[PDB]
Design a protein around this ligand. Sequence first.
Ligand SMILES: *[C@@H]1O[C@H](CO)[C@@H](O)[C@H](O)[C@H]1NC(C)=O
Lengths: 42, 49
Amino acid sequence: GYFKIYSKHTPIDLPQGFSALEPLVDLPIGINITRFQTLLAL
Amino acid sequence: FNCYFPLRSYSFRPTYGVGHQPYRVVVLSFELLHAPATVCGPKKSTNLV
Ligand SMILES: *[C@@H]1O[C@H](CO)[C@@H](O)[C@H](O)[C@H]1NC(C)=O
C-alpha cells in the first residue's frame, strides 16, 4: 500500500564505480499497478 | 391538473418561532478502506529528561 521512490544525482554507457541511493518519497496510495511510461520535453 | 413544482422556497423571516428558524446541519461520516488510513488524530508529547 505504499509507493516508494529512491533517487541519486551524480556528475560524470553506465559507468563504473559505486554509489548508494537514498530514499526520497513514500506515498500512501495503495493502488494496483502493472505498467508505466515516461515523458519528454519536445 | 394535479401537477405542481416539487420545490418550494424556505421563506424565512425573523418573526418565525424557535421551531421554524433555520438550522445548519453538518454530517461527518468516517470511511475505513484498504488504505494506510492517513487521517488519525492528535498525539500528545511531554518534555524529555
Ligand atoms: C489489482 O489487485 C486487486 C487486488 O488483488 C484487484 O482487485 C484488482 O482487480 C487488480 N487490478 C486489476 C486491473 O486487475
